[PDB]
Design a protein around this nucleic acid. Structure first.
Ligand code: ZN
Ligand code: ZN
Ligand code: ZN
Lengths: 102, 48, 64, 511, 48, 49, 214
DNA sequence: GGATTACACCCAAGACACCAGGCACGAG
RNA sequence: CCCGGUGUCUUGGGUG
DNA sequence: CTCGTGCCTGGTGTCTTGAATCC
């Protein structure tokens, strides 16, 4: 299992390779990446497992800034940060990265 | 055989409590019989 | 003599646990549940064998 | 086959596809004892080698397991461990051989077996004395108690003879003290004693006149009726089945908020199962339990009316000896559930990977093998983590000081009452021991009178199915329990088979 | 939960026969030999 | 030398013998105490005196 | 701003629940499966979220509006203690449940794994991906003396001596830098990469011996 | 609820499970 | 070149 | 040459529920 460093979702790593990040596949394009890319945008190290069942009405989800995302498992703390080159590319897309590492 | 084996511990307990009750009782040089607190138990041992 | 007993039952309305008090009057066969919080009161008949779990059971069926 | 199938279930949404995972245990096969070296080579193990290399003389056990995969949008033999083999039994490699070969295997023809070899040490199982199951015993109670007489029975099934539950019926009220002299019972998994009349109603027989027709079979005697008088009036206000069952469901006090719509249906299980499970556990047979309950109350009052002595707890006919067979089954039962749980906990992780399990990997033979070895080596009868609240000394190192001592040691019996409490009953040589245990052979000291030894011609019953006996009784004229009325049957004899009031005959002398 | 557990360990360190609650156990499963149990009984410091 | 042995020497009045048995002939030990507080809290270096 | 996301009386309640130690993540998982499976049915599981904090052993937190939903979420869960032990959290304590939380170059850390477990090391370099680093540590070597390692059967710490290696058993790379048995030693120190998760950065207490050396 | 079941000696047989991490071996 | 010691906790059977 | 997979070792660790009578 790895945690996305952009949305915090927790999925089996191969999922990040097979389908990309459900919440941020569009800007992150992990589906069409190599393993080095997936491992730079997702972390094997994370803490605080959160079942979010109702993203739009959960206060827990709002605090973790996952209220606009899909129901699923999320992490309170994701270790590592997105590589500066990917942060720069996301910013070109109007996406603002707020690190989830504390 | 059961009686001898059982009642030996009954009397063994009896002797233990008796000894602890009485162990500190001594005849002193004035003839009185006293315990370790100096309480008089008999003014003259065995009354004789 | 009346029996005033505290219980570990949850009030069916305010949901505070360990706040339901049971007063069992056997001389008149009248049992009384009381909250200590919202203080909702509920009366039900009791026999001689009843206990705080008997009237609290009758309170669950009186709601449903 | 006591719990023959494991079942899982999982609703998946992403097209709901119920996928029950099921595993079925089949035939058992046994192999002769085998030594497997670190090499990997195998050979038949004989006793002497095990004695010389501190091995365990044990047989590998293999169990058929069957997989099946229900799916609804709405194989190879596995090894469970090793079981120690009793020497000279049918599964020991010495049972054959004959006289010519025994000397070559360094075995002595005077050695009669009956023991196990665990880490090179010879361990013998000591027969464990216990009280019989499925029998009613009545005892009197001491003066500073509101109870004066108690009837007691320990529930036990026939299939495998394992304990289930224990039940009591207490008669309150002392001599001219206790006022209303009523009778309440004790039920498994219920808090405080419930009056008898209430449980009669709770089984489907509310009619008072019917209740007394089930207990007392002599309307003529006032005494066998005046003592049941307060029991009727203290349970009068419970006038139908539903409010009776409800009260029992409230007594348990488990999961506050069960409700009537269901608190009845929870108590109906506590009445159908657990309460007297030796009679039956299938539905729609509550007539047998109601009739049996009346018998108990009848026996209780006969002792309270001084028309029958209280039972003698030391009467040997009320006793049983657990030997190697029954003792191993109880231990094997506990360990096989432990193995079962480890399989179940392992499937919930190995199926989230959605990968076909290899089966053997999900069977850790160390659970049974270490379990049996540890208990036979130490005598601690239970799971290793629970050395407390168990029984010690069931297995002992076989005394080989002299030949006579070996014979005595293999025929020893033990009563597990305990050193504490001298007592003037157990240790004593009761009259009914005649011809069954030795009147002379008993240890000096703390065990004196509690450890006994079987007389020379004694034997122990191996066990027999009760089903052929029932067929013989009905063929000869036994009449069912639905046809029985104390007014019509004021003189016939009751018939019990393993403690069950099955049928009553009118002419017992020919039968 | 943390503070009560410190109270627990300091209690069973001195007396592990507290009535009404389970005994502290070693990994081996047998109860811990507290200081109170060191002094009482036939084999303890005083009688033994 | 059990509890019952102890009692026999008391009955004989052999107080001197009983002292020696339980000290010199067993586990005799020397301790230092503080004359003020009475505790065995003294730190005693005997070569430095 | 995070300060605009604080909880209010209008937000769902949060209950804590005691669970079997080590089974907190499993319970959170199980709750999610139950929630998703019942979505849109006539009996939805009326919880919003559930979570478990590592720092809070044996306790799952569950977000809902009614206590009955908490009982519903846990019903049949074999990892949950059957006693009715569910406790209420105050709104003012919600944020403190979801708090997320150095290793600069030239600083000292303690190694947590391998033959160097427990040893003090300087954090000379950090891996780009961020996954690892490079530590400067006093070696524990034998110069191949008994060749034809564990932390319990390791050798005493001592600076690498290249002339000893030359004599007894070696590749020069640079000034003062040798590769010896496929490890790098510069000016007597091993430089070796360790996972950041294998090094302790907090509350490190230098020993007597370390004060004597460094 | 706790309190206890006389004193001394000798013999033999047993002692901690579960999961994450690295290292070594085999295959493509 | 003097000095030099190794086990703890339980179970089962005995002896008197 | 590089990745998949089994074995050894150390830090950590708890729970499905299931003998009697004196003060
Ligand atoms: Zn994402
Ligand atoms: Zn209320
Ligand atoms: Zn002082």
């Amino acid at each position: 299992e790895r945690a996305c460093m952009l949305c915090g979702i927790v999925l089996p790593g191969r999922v990040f390779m097979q389908n990309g990040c459900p919440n941020c596949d569009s800007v992150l394009n992990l589906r069409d990446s190599d393993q080095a890319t997936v491992n730079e945008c997702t972390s094997s190290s994370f803490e605080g497992l959160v079942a979010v069942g109702d993203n739009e009405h959960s206060w827990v989800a709002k605090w973790l800034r996952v209220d606009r995302f899909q129901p699923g498992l999320y992490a309170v703390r994701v270790d590592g940060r997105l590589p500066s080159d990917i942060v720069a590319a996301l910013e070109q897309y109007g996406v603002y990265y707020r690190p989830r590492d504390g | 055989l059961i009686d001898t084996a059982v009642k030996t511990a009954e009397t063994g307990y009896i002797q233990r409590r008796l000894v602890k009750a009485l162990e500190d009782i001594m005849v002193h040089y004035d003839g009185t019989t006293r315990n370790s607190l100096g309480d008089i138990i008999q003014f003259l041992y065995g009354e004789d | 003599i009346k029996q005033k007993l505290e219980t570990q039952f949850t009030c069916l309305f305010c949901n505070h646990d360990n706040s339901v008090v049971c007063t069992l009057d056997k001389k008149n066969s009248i049992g009384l549940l009381e909250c200590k919080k919202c203080n909702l009161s509920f009366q039900a008949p009791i026999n001689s064998l009843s206990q705080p779990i008997d009237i609290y059971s009758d309170w669950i069926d009186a709601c449903e | 086959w006591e719990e023959p199938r494991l079942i899982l279930d999982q609703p998946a949404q992403h097209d709901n596809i119920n996928k029950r995972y099921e595993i079925r245990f089949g035939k058992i096969y046994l192999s002769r004892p085998t030594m497997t070296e670190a090499d990997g080579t195998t050979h038949a193990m004989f006793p002497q080698e095990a004695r010389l290399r501190n091995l365990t003389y044990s047989s590998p056990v293999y169990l058929d397991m069957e997989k099946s995969m229900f799916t609804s949008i709405d194989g190879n033999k596995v090894h469970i461990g090793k079981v120690p083999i009793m020497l000279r039994s049918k599964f020991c490699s010495l049972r054959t051989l004959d006289e010519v070969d025994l000397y070559k295997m360094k075995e002595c023809p005077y050695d009669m077996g009956g023991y196990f070899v665990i880490n090179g040490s010879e361990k013998v199982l000591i027969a464990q004395e216990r009280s019989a199951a499925n029998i009613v015993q009545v005892f009197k109670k001491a003066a500073p108690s509101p109870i004066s007489h108690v009837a007691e029975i320990r529930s036990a099934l026939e299939k495998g003879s394992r304990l289930i539950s224990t039940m009591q019926i207490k008669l309150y009220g002392r001599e001219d003290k206790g006022t209303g002299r009523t009778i309440k019972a004790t039920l498994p998994y219920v808090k405080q004693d419930i009056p008898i009349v209430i449980v009669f109603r709770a089984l489907g027989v509310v009619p008072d006149g019917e209740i007394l027709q089930h207990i007392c079979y002599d309307e003529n005697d006032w005494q066998m009726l005046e003592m049941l008088k307060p029991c009727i009036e203290e349970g009068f206000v419970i006038q139908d089945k539903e409010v009776a069952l409800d009260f029992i469901g409230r007594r348990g006090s488990a999961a506050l908020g069960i409700r009537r719509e269901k608190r009845i249906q929870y108590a109906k299980d506590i009445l159908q199962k657990e309460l007297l499970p030796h009679i039956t556990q299938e539905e729609g047979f509550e007539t047998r339990k109601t009739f049996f309950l009346g018998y108990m109350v009848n026996r209780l009052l006969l002792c309270a009316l001084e028309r029958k002595d209280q039972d003698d707890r030391d009467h040997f006919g009320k006793k049983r000896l657990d030997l190697a067979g029954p003792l191993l089954a109880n231990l094997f039962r506990i360990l096989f559930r432990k193995l079962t749980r480890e399989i179940y906990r392992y499937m919930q992780r190995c199926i989230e990977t959605d990968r076909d399990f290899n089966l053997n990997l999900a069977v850790k033979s160390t659970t049974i093998t270490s379990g049996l070895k540890y208990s036979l080596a130490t005598g601690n009868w239970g799971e290793q983590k629970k050395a407390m609240s168990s029984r010690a000394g069931v297995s002992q190192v076989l005394n080989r000081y002299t030949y006579s001592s070996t014979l005595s040691h293999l025929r020893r019996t033990n009563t597990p009452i305990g050193r504490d409490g001298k007592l003037a009953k157990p240790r004593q040589l009761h009259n009914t021991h005649w011809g069954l245990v030795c009147p002379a052979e008993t240890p000096e000291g703390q065990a004196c009178g509690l450890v006994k030894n079987l007389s020379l011609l004694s034997g122990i019953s191996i066990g027999s199915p009760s089903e052929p006996i029932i067929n013989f009784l009905e063929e000869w004229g036994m009449e069912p329990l639905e046809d029985y009325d104390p007014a019509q049957h004021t003189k016939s004899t009751r018939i019990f088979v393993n403690g069950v009031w099955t049928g009553i005959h009118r002419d017992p002398s020919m039968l | 939960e943390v503070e009560q557990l410190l109270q627990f360990h300091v209690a069973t360190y001195m007396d592990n026969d507290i009535a009404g609650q389970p005994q502290a156990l070693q990994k081996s499963g047998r109860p811990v030999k507290a200081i109170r149990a060191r002094l009482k009984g036939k084999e303890g410091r005083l009688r033994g | 030398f059990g509890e019952m042995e102890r009692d026999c020497m008391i009955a004989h009045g052999a107080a001197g013998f009983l002292k020696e048995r339980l000290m010199e002939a067993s586990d005799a030990f020397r301790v230092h105490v503080c004359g003020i507080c009475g505790l065995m809290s003294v730190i005693a270096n005997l070569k430095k005196n | 701003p995070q300060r605009l996301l604080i909880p209010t009386v209008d937000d769902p309640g949060i209950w804590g629940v005691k669970v079997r130690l080590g089974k907190e993540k499993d319970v959170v998982r199980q709750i999610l499966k139950k929630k998703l499976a019942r979505e849109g049915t006539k009996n939805p599981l009326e919880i919003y979220s559930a979570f478990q904090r590592d720092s809070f052993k044996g306790h799952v937190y569950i977000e809902a509006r009614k206590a009955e939903a908490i009982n519903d979420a846990l019903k049949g869960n074999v990892n949950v203690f059957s006693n009715n032990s569910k406790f209420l959290v105050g709104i003012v304590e919600y944020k403190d449940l979801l708090r997320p939380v150095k290793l600069t170059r030239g600083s000292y850390v303690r190694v947590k794994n391998g033959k160097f477990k427990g040893d003090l090391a300087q954090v000379d370099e950090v891996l780009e991906n961020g996954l690892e680093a490079r530590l400067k540590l006093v070696p524990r070597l034998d110069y191949g003396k008994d060749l034809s390692y564990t932390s319990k059967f390791r050798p005493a710490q001592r600076l690498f001596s290249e002339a000893e290696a030359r004599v007894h058993e070696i590749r020069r790379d640079r000034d003062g830098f040798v590769t010896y048995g496929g490890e790098e030693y510069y000016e007597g120190f091993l430089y070796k990469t360790f996972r950041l998760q294998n090094l302790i950065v907090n509350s490190i207490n230098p020993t007597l011996n370390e004060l004597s050396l460094f």
